[PDB]
Amino acid sequence: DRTPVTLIGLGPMGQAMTRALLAAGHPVTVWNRTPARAAGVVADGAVLAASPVEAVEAGDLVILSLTDYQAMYDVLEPATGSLAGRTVVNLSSDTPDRTRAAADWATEHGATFLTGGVMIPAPMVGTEEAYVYYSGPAEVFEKHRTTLTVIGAPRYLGEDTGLAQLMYQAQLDVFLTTLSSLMHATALLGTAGVSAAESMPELIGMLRTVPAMLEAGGENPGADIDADKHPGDLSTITMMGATADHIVGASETAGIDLALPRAVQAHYRRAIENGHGGDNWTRIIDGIRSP
Amino acid sequence: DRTPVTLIGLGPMGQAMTRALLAAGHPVTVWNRTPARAAGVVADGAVLAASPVEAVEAGDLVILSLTDYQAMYDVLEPATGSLAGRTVVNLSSDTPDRTRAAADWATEHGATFLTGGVMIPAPMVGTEEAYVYYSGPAEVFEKHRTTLTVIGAPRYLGEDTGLAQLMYQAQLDVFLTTLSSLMHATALLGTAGVSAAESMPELIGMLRTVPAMLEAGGENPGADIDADKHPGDLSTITMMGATADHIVGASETAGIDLALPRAVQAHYRRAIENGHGGDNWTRIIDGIRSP
Numbered sequence A, B: 001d002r003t004p005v006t007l008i009g010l011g012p013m014g015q016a017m018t019r020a021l022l023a024a025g026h027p028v029t030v031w032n033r034t035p036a037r038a039a040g041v042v043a044d045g046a047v048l049a050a051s052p053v054e055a056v057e058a059g060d061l062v063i064l065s066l067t068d069y070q071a072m073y074d075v076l077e078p079a080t081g082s083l084a085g086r087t088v089v090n091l092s093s094d095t096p097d098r099t100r101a102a103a104d105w106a107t108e109h110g111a112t113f114l115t116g117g118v119m120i121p122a123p124m125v126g127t128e129e130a131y132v133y134y135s136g137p138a139e140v141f142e143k144h145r146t147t148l149t150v151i152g153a154p155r156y157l158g159e160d161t162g163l164a165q166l167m168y169q170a171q172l173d174v175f176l177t178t179l180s181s182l183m184h185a186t187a188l189l190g191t192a193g194v195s196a197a198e199s200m201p202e203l204i205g206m207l208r209t210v211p212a213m214l215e216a217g218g219e220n221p222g223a224d225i226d227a228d229k230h231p232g233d234l235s236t237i238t239m240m241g242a243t244a245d246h247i248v249g250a251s252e253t254a255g256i257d258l259a260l261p262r263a264v265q266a267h268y269r270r271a272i273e274n275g276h277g278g279d280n281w282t283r284i285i286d287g288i289r290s291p
C-alpha cells in the first residue's frame, strides 16, 4: 500500500510516525506550525507543505499528532474547504466529548473521522510492541487499517468516536498517576538521604511484580468488581487504609506533597465510613464512582 | 534451623509466615487477640499460647504481624516484664518515627529490635518471589537472618530502624496509588458501559509495559533525577500536563472522584508555573519536594 499520507504535528510522535510510514513506502506530506522542526523528516523523504491547505490536499488520509484538539482547529481552520472526501485520523489527547464534537465538525466539512490513542512512546512506534486504540465508523477504519498498522497494532473498540479517547484517558489515568507516585516515593526516600538511583530500581522492581501480586491466591479483580465480590480474606480495606494513613503521616513528616496520598487515603476512609472496612481493596471503586 | 519462634498476629500474613516457619522445621508458638483464628495453624503444628506473656517466653525471637504499631503496644503491654534478652521483629506497617520510638521502647524493656517490611501477599510468603526489607542493628539481623530467610529474601538496609519502614511506606505509596488509579480508570470506562472484566486486562496489560516504556530512547530516570537531567526530547511536561487536564475533564464529566486526578494535574501545573513546561516529567519531583 503506497497510499499518500498527510501528517500534521511534528513532535516526537509525529516524527516517529512519519518515519515509519516513509519506511513502509508511503509518500508522506507533512505540515508543522514550526516549519524548521520538519527538517529531520524532510531529509528522510517527507515533503514539507507550505500551507495546511496544501498538506490536506496531498492525501486522502490526514493524521494529526498534536498536543490537544484545540490545535486541530487552529491548524485545520484555514483548510476547512479542502477536507471533503478525506479521512481525518486524530491521534491526539483530549476529553471524550471534545472528540465526539470534533467528529461531527469533520462530518459537516465533508470528511470522515477516526479517533486513535497511541499507547507507546516515540522510540517504540512501528515496532512489535506498538499498539493503538481506534474508535469511529467501522468502514472508515477498514479502509485505512493497513496504513494505520504501520504505526502499531490497531485495537478497534467500536463506533463511538469518544471511546478510543476514553480508553486513552483511562490508560493515562493509570500511567500518569503511577508516575506521580514513583516521583512521590522517590521524594520520600530522598528525605532520609536515599538517592533516586538507589530508590527508583527498588520501586520499579516492585511495580514489575504488581500483575502477579494481584493474581496471587486466585483473586481476579475485574470479574470480582463486576460480580460485586469484594471478600477481605487476604487483605482488607482496614489494613490497607491504615497503611494509607501511615503514608500520609510519613509524607507530612517528610515535608512533601500531601494531595496525592490524601486522595488515596480518602478512598479507604470512604469505604470504611460506608461500612466495608472488612472488604477487599477493590471496594474503593464504589466511593470513586459516587463522590 | 530448629530455633523456636513466636509469632503474634494471625491475619493472612501471620498465618502464612507461621506455616512457612513450621514447614522449615521451626517450632512456632502463636498468640492472637482472637484465639479461634489460630485453629488453622495449630492443626499445622503451631502451639497456641494462652497468654501474651507465655508466647513471649517461649522464644528468643518474637515476630509481630499486626495492622499497626499501636497493636504491638496493646498486645505486649502485659508482657513487658518478659521482653528482656529477646528480639522483637516487627513486620507491621506504621510511620518511620513510630517505629524508631518503638525500637527505643524495646531497648528500655531489655529487648533488641528489628524492623521488617514484607513486600509480597500471603500466598507468596516463603516462595522464591518473596522479599522483606530489614533495618536495625547489624548484629541482631545477623543473629536471626537464617530464621528470617524462611519468610523471604532479606534486604538489609542498615542501622536506622526507621529505614525499612520508610522503604515499605515508599513502596506502598507506589502500590496503593497505582491500585487507586486502576480503580479510577475502571470507574471511568464504566461510565461508558465498559465492564471491569474488559477494562482491567487492558489497564494491567499497559502497566506490565511501564518499566520498558520508561527505558525507551535510553532514559534512565533515577540517575537523571540525581543529576538534575530533565530533558524534554521525547515527552514534555506541557504535553503530559495537558493529558492530566484531559483526565480531570473526563472525570468531571464522568461524575467520579476528582481528588486523585487533580493531585496529578497539580504536579504538572506546578512544574509549568515554575517554568519547566519544556522538561521531562521527572521534573515534577521538584514541586513534590517543595509544596
Ligand SMILES: NC(=O)c1ccc[n+]([C@@H]2O[C@H](COP(=O)([O-])OP(=O)(O)OC[C@H]3O[C@@H](n4cnc5c(N)ncnc54)[C@H](OP(=O)(O)O)[C@@H]3O)[C@@H](O)[C@H]2O)c1
Binding pocket: A008, A009, A010, A011, A012, A013, A014, A032, A033, A034, A037, A065, A066, A067, A068, A070, A071, A074, A075, A091, A092, A093, A118, A119, A120, A121, A122, B234, B235, B236, B239, B243
Ligand atoms: N510523547 C509521547 O511519548 C506520547 C505517547 C503517546 C501519545 N502521545 C500524544 O501524542 C500527541 C503528540 O505528542 P508529542 O509528545 O509528539 O508532542 P507535543 O509536544 O504534544 O506536540 C505535538 C505537536 O503539537 C503542535 N501544537 C501544539 N499546540 C498547537 C497549536 N495550538 N497549533 C498548532 N500546532 C500545535 C506542536 O507544534 P510546534 O512543533 O510548532 O511546537 C507539535 O508539532 C499528544 O496529544 C500526546 O498526548 C504522546
Ligand SMILES: NC(=O)c1ccc[n+]([C@@H]2O[C@H](COP(=O)([O-])OP(=O)(O)OC[C@H]3O[C@@H](n4cnc5c(N)ncnc54)[C@H](OP(=O)(O)O)[C@@H]3O)[C@@H](O)[C@H]2O)c1
Binding pocket: A234, A235, A236, A239, A243, B008, B009, B010, B011, B012, B013, B014, B032, B033, B034, B037, B065, B066, B067, B068, B070, B071, B074, B075, B091, B092, B093, B118, B119, B120, B121, B122
Ligand atoms: N495482606 C497483605 O497482603 C500484606 C502484604 C505486606 C504487608 N502486610 C502488612 O502485614 C501486617 C499484617 O497484615 P494482615 O493483612 O496479615 O492482617 P491485618 O488484617 O492487618 O491483621 C493482623 C493481626 O492484627 C491484629 N490486630 C489488629 N489490631 C490489633 C490490636 N489493637 N490488638 C491486637 N491485635 C490487633 C488482628 O487481631 P484479630 O485477628 O484479633 O483481629 C490480626 O491478628 C500489616 O501491618 C500489613 O500492612 C500485609
Ligand SMILES: CN[C@H]1CCc2c(cccc2OC)C1
Binding pocket: A213, A214, A219, A234, A235, A240, B118, B119, B120, B121, B175
Ligand atoms: C489483592 N491485592 C493484594 C496484593 C498484595 C498486597 C495487598 C495489600 C497490601 C500489600 C500487598 O503486597 C505488598 C493486597
Ligand SMILES: CN[C@H]1CCc2c(cccc2OC)C1
Binding pocket: A118, A119, A120, A121, A175, B213, B214, B215, B219, B234, B235, B240, B281
Ligand atoms: C518516559 N516518559 C514517556 C513514556 C511514555 C509516555 C509519556 C507520556 C505520554 C504517553 C506515554 O506513553 C504511553 C512519557
